[PDB]
Amino acid sequence: AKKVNSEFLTLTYGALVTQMLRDFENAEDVNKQLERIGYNMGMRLIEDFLARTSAPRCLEMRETADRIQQAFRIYLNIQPTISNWSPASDEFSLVFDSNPLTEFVELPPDLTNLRYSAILSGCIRGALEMVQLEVQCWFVQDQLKGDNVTELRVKFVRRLEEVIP
Amino acid sequence: MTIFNLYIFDKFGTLLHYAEWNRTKKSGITREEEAKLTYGMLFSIKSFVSKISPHDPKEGFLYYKTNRYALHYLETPSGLKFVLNTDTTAINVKELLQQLYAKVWVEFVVRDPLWTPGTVVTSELFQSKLDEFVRQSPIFGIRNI
Amino acid sequence: SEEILFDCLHAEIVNYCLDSNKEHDLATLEYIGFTTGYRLIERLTREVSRFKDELETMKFICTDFWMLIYKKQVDNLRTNNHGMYVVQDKAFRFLTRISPGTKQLEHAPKFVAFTCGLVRGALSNLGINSTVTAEVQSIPACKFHIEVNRN
Amino acid sequence: MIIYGVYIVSKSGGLIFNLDNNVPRIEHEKTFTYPLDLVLDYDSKKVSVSFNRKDGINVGHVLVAVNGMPVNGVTLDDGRDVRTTLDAPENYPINLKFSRPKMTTNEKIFLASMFYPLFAIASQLSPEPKSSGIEILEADTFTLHCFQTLTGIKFIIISETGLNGIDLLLRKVYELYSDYVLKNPFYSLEMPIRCELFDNKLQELLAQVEKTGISNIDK
């Protein structure tokens, strides 16, 4: 009893993905819904992550990597391992052996372009812009699409700054 | 003799809420412009220190004091701002504001579905829970480090 | 603090409701969820021998499923003779975060669907059937009004 | 106890006197390789970094000298500009100096100017009635103590953050003020006080407080 309290979440997510996918025929449309809904979710989650980890704020991508992988530790109980840094330290890679949020959602649904981790991408970006870090997010490798490890990618695009006092 | 008041401001500089208990000097300014003025002032002080700092200001500004009252400031890395008024001299309250953020706000605001992001909180539970968390230590005085 | 994910996610579902249907929410969440909980319920109080059929009040199994998910106990459990009955609960988690003042009442059907959509059993009152309506008068106080799939 | 700087301003709020007690800014050099993780950003005469504050190169560390050759506002000494120097690869591997902009005097004037309202507008719409303004402003790595003359002039100094027993030191700098305004009361607020005699008397007050004695009111 209760190895995982929140295995509930992944099934809810599967419900949402199939509900949209029935609603909107295109993998692209649901991609935008996943991204924006991750955006709002990550906006919700980053403040709690900073209430617990109580980080100063991220002024350096090594710090950003440690912070977000710590959040994965504390939110999805996963241990992504930072790797593949940019020479300019913009890119780094998060090694998910098991995408926690999927437990054989479907290996073939007969649908490429349907990317699952887009919810993570939305969460990471919305979180980051709460802390004034506009970084784009995508997924270099993804088990479901035929890979062996699911690998998120983020590259430091711009340093947002508070303005207009 | 509980706290005077307490302020919230987003990373865009908008007043989220103002709760008052014991402020007495009846304001000639309607509260919204006052909140704007205070947010601008605090921003000014941030620039002020970030220029005239001898070295890295890791947390930058902390608070300011008067002879007859005092005030303290809290910075949230997301850019939300926390301000309350206290008396001049009692235990520090930087930690008390950290606690209020990490518990009361993160619970009774963001975990409220019917508070849309970036607006005024109007939850009777967030109101009453703020009232009770202040009534926790209705302590007046700061002497903050 | 794994709940925060689900609180936020259900919150955003409370947000978007497209006008095509009120509840686009199908129940596969409920089906696969009770199957999961019953993976954790690899033991429930029914005798080893197959003929002697004992029914488990899905009221009780609902109590336990809340402890597995909703974590807080169902309180006031009034029941008619036949499969129609109700639960009266003073506190509901998703409505614990809303103001207790009876002002935000609409947000219930997303709540009550989640307790529907659980596969039946042949012997009635066996613990798993579900088809449920809600009438939330007071905010924390959900009122899940049950109707069995049968009479 | 070390004092980073000492200041006084007038009824105008203009910076009348800005002696600094020699507190240098940090510096860094490192043999830079191919394009640097320091996120260099040009912002209006500042050639700085916006991110990746590594190795003790803060974000605010403005580029100060390039490869030994000095660098000036946006371009360099020799006429090269930071951009052309940087993005050309084969120059690398190279050293870059970096430090924080010691705000040139005029900028300090502007800083004092902008601060004065905060003093005079320290929530004059206070909670507490018939209140009084700011006196003590602690900060990250400095602390500001001001002494109103109780009518008129303001007395603000910049001290080590973790310290007490400085307001009496402000009273003594007030005494030095009286000593000097004895010189020429015509030599008033309108002109700033730059008279090296009183000023070395102040630097002797500094000399005393650099040593242990701040008790022993001796100045």
Residue numbers in the entry:
A (entry chain A): 10 to 174
B (entry chain C): 1 to 145
C (entry chain B): 2 to 152
D (entry chain D): 1 to 219
Q: What wording appears in the published article?
A:
Expressing TRAPPIII without the TRAPPC12 and TRAPPC13 subunits reduces its size by ~100 kDa, close to the combined weight of two subunits, indicating that their absence does not affect the binding of the other nine subunits. Moreover, in the case of the miniTRAPPIII, similar narrow rod and triangular particles were found in the cryo‐EM micrographs, but threefold symmetrical particles rarely appeared among the 2D class averages. We reanalysed cryo‐EM images of miniTRAPPIII following a similar strategy to that used for TRAPPIII. The comparison between the TRAPPIII and miniTRAPPIII class 2D averages and 3D models revealed that the flat rod was similar, but in miniTRAPPIII there was density missing at the region of interaction between the two arms. We concluded TRAPPC12 and TRAPPC13 were located in this region of TRAPPIII, forming one of the vertexes of the triangle.
The TRAPP complexes are nucleotide exchange factors that play essential roles in membrane traffic and autophagy. TRAPPII activates Rab11, and TRAPPIII activates Rab1, with the two complexes sharing a core of small subunits that affect nucleotide exchange but being distinguished by specific large subunits that are essential for activity in vivo. We report a cryo‐EM structure of the entire Drosophila TRAPPIII complex. The TRAPPIII‐specific subunits TRAPPC8 and TRAPPC11 hold the catalytic core like a pair of tongs, with TRAPPC12 and TRAPPC13 positioned at the joint between them.
